């Protein structure tokens, strides 16, 4: 309850610790050195081994010129703290084999730079939540959460990757690749991807864990826009696929929830899937599993799941590990108003309150149809969608600067205000959102 990673984490990595008990770290400057990261940098701040929650007193885009791995655990990334907001750009952020890691209010958009990478990734870690952060323009895959244990992504925007770039293997818009040991993608808006809205891991990629713990809970997501595919995989994996909303849009040609990839080594109740809502297909919405194809064998090609097929549970699954954090689920109808109407989703607020930068406002109301999308809507680079990146951080510039004299990552003017509680930074934080 006070476990909690924060007041609305929810799903298997709902206890995560992050840093909450750790230093505050200050990232006061946008530099990136990766040779010799000055204190004061988001890689020198990353880098550190102890637990720490960083917190932000600047705004606008670091331009990574090397990805970071982060290897060290007990960690928050605080980017609500930001007084405008911050962005990651040039190079991913990616975990590795880390423990206890929180990161909200975060923005990654690779751009068209010199790596063919992720904008984001987390792999081989356990105890991860990821809240309210945005990814996209990236030219590998956007963000990419697999053989993760207690992993929890919610209320965030992954949307519009790059799809004819600079990748060697040609074209590659791609959403990411979504897995883990209990790990729960939630209350999410997956937009604008060629294909992989996500790609189940299953049992795949060189998992630390044995194949009956690949299980994953989707749902309450909103995916627009895919193009010839949008979820498949899950080789040997299981999940559960409940209340999410699929809404084509001018890309989107497999009329699908799921292509559920060949699995020999389950043979019965692999998925359970019920209640999803596919804008525009009536039939599919009052029977979901006229939208599950199922691959018969390694190369056999999409064909609709048999309907008395019990790969297919009647009841929702339950992984066989430990406690089931499974999270509450809500109905598609208020995941859409939350989401799409109210836009609780995304990096939507900065130390000065809420915000939803320009560049996500599109994405939500390219899905509800209040703003139109140029032809297919797959973008080859941001620079369709943003004049210059320079332009693009501008509108982080304009909020007013968090005072923080004394240095404790507090704005000094929520201290004067909270005199009973005014060094309370967890406290604090939490005022920014609340
Ligand atoms: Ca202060």
Redesign the pocket.
């Known amino acids: 309850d006070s476990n909690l990673a924060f007041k609305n984490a929810d799903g298997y990595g709902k206890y995560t610790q992050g840093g909450r008990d750790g230093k505050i770290y200050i990232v006061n400057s946008l530099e990136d050195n990766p040779k010799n990261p000055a204190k004061g940098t988001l890689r020198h701040a990353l880098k550190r081994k102890y637990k720490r929650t960083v917190v932000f007193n600047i705004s606008g885009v670091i331009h990574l010129k090397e990805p970071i791995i982060v290897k060290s655990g007990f960690l928050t990334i605080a980017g609500q703290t930001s007084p405008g907001g911050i962005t990651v750009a040039g190079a991913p952020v990616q975990v590795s084999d880390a423990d206890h890691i929180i990161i909200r209010y975060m923005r990654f958009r690779l751009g068209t730079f010199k790596l063919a990478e992720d904008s984001m990734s987390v792999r081989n870690s356990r105890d991860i939540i990821i809240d309210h952060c945005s990814f996209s323009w990236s030219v590998d895959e956007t963000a990419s959460f697999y053989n993760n244990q207690r992993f929890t992504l919610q209320n965030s925007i992954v949307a519009a990757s790059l799809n004819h770039s600079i990748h060697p293997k040609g074209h590659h818009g791609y959403g990411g690749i979504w897995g883990g040991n209990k790990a729960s993608f939630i209350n999410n808006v997956i937009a604008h991807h060629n294909s992989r809205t996500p790609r189940l891991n299953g049992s795949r990629l060189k998992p630390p864990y044995d194949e009956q713990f690949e299980f994953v809970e989707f749902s309450n997501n909103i995916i627009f826009n895919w193009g010839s595919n949008n979820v498949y995989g899950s080789e040997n994996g299981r999940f559960n696929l409940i209340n999410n909303i699929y809404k084509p849009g001018p890309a989107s040609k497999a009329i699908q929830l799921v292509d559920l990839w060949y699995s020999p080594n389950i043979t019965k109740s692999q998925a359970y899937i019920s209640g999803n809502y596919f804008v525009g297909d009536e039939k599919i919405t009052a029977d979901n599993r006229l939208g599950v194809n199922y691959r018969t064998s390694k190369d056999a090609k999409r064909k609709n799941i048999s309907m008395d097929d019990k790969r297919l549970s009647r009841v929702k699954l339950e992984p066989i590990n430990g406690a089931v954090n499974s999270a509450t689920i809500n109905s598609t109808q208020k995941t859409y108003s939350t989401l799409i109407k109210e836009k609780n989703v995304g990096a939507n607020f900065n130390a000065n309150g809420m915000f939803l930068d320009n560049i996500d406002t599109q994405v939500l109301n390219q899905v509800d149809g209040s703003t139109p999308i140029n032809g297919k809507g797959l973008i080859n680079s941001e620079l369709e969608m943003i004049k210059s990146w320079e332009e693009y951080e501008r509108q982080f510039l304009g909020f007013p600067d968090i005072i ?3 240095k ?1 990552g ?3 003017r929520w ?1 004067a205000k909270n005199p009973t509680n005014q060094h309370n930074i967890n406290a604090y934080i939490n005022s920014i959102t609340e």
Do not use: T
């Open positions: 923080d004299k004394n404790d507090i704005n000094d201290a």
